[PDB]
Structure formats: C-alpha cells, structure tokens
Design a protein around this ligand. Structure first.
Ligand SMILES: CCN[C@H]1CO[C@@H]2OCC[C@H](OC(=O)N[C@@H](Cc3ccccc3)[C@H](O)CN(CC(C)C)S(=O)(=O)c3ccc(OC)cc3)[C@@H]21
Ligand SMILES: [Cl-]
Ligand SMILES: [Cl-]
Ligand SMILES: [Cl-]
Ligand code: NA
Lengths: 99, 99
C-alpha cells in the first residue's frame, strides 16, 4: 500500500499472539512495544529520545506480523507511550519513503 | 526519490539560510529542530516523546527547504537530540510511506 501522512501511519500488528496498534516510524532505529511478555532470553537496554531515556528489555529474533507482512528481528519492550515499528523491521517489509 | 530505511533517512534542510541535517520522521506529528534563531513571535508548546515531555518554542509560517523541496509551516525549537522533520512538513513535500 501507499500510506499518506495526513494522519498518523498506524497499522495493526500481531506480536506474542496479541493484536496491537502500532505507528510506522521512520525516525525510530528500533522497534519498541508497550509492556508485554515475550518468550526467551532478554537483556536490559536504555533507549533515548525526546524527553530522555527509558529502560527496556531487548528480545532478539521475535516474529511480528506488520499489516499482514511477517518479519523477524529484535523487539524492545518497555514503558513507551506508543507502540513503534522502527527501521529494523520496516526494512524487512520493504517500506520506503517516497516524494 | 525513493528512500530505503537500512540507514537513518537523513536529508539536508535549509532554514534561516543555514544548512542542517534532519531526520525524515513519520513517527513525529510535528517538526522539531535544535536551538537556533528564528524570526517572529513564538508560542508555547509541550511535546511528549519516548522519555517524557519537553517544552519547546513554536514558530509558525517558517520557510524551510527539505531535500530541495520548499515548505512553509510550523517549526518547534527545543532540546531535541536530532533535527526531526515531522508529518506537518512531510505532507507539504508530498511524502508517502510505501510497502
Ligand atoms: C504524544 C505524542 N507526541 C509525539 C508525536 O509527535 C509529536 O511531535 C514530534 C515529537 C514527538 O514525536 C516523537 O517523539 N516521536 C517518536 C515516536 C513517538 C510517538 C509518540 C509518542 C512517543 C514517541 C519518534 O518517531 C521516534 N523517536 C526517535 C526520534 C525522537 C529521534 S523515539 O520514539 O524516541 C525512539 C524509538 C526507537 C528507538 O530505538 C533506538 C529510539 C528512540 C511528539
Ligand atoms: Cl533487528
Ligand atoms: Cl531494499
Ligand atoms: Cl505546519
Ligand atoms: Na530471542
């Protein structure tokens, strides 16, 4: 699809067996999801943005379905105010910015 | 252009006659730039990001060139970690996300 940017580019995702709304975010290096449980190993990480840093759990090799497209990669889990799909998974679904 | 997301989608912008680097950010509603001098009056605005809220200065109807495309609109100035081009100006340059 082609998503215009008049409105937030929100899509439905499936992660950890749950459906969630997430923002397709080209200004995010990494994917960050609100608190939830994921299977396997994780390690702590700090990530920063406007407002400063938050502590997150880093899970690697997680499958996510993004608007119907399956991708695998690292997912950060922590107290983010919005679920964000960052470049590490946007690349896997072939997303590009065009103008 | 068609911009992939394997690296940060950084572009050159021109504002106040200065060249700067900025991030095309579909996750940002608004454009936020690091501290600089802009003409005219400003208005207060509180913006929230991943680590919390910051106060910024809101300047309206500012001329800004973005990867060679002319835009005129609102620019927020404040302690952002990186210059961010948000949806308010990505729509002015015709940008869309595609996959
Ligand atoms: C209330 C919403 N206002 C937000 C919405 O737009 C507003 O205007 C612009 C400034 C602020 O927007 C954001 O902070 N946008 C966030 C994504 C984001 C969206 C919503 C809430 C929080 C974050 C960005 O798209 C991605 N951010 C990075 C950029 C600030 C460089 S980030 O979420 O902090 C980030 C993500 C992954 C990551 O891995 C290393 C590291 C950092 C305001
Ligand atoms: Cl990854
Ligand atoms: Cl590619
Ligand atoms: Cl505007
Ligand atoms: Na894992």
């Amino acid at each position: 699809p082609q998503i215009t940017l008049w409105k937030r580019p929100l899509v439905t995702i499936k992660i950890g067996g749950q459906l969630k709304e997430a923002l397709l975010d080209t200004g995010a290096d990494d994917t960050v999801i609100e608190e939830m449980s994921l299977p396997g190993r994780w390690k702590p990480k700090m990530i920063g943005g406007i407002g400063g840093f938050i502590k997150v759990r880093q899970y690697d090799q997680i499958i996510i379905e993004i608007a119907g497209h399956k991708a695998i990669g690292t997912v950060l889990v922590g107290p983010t105010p919005v679920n964000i799909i960052g470049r590490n998974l946007l690349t896997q679904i072939g997303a590009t910015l065009n103008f």
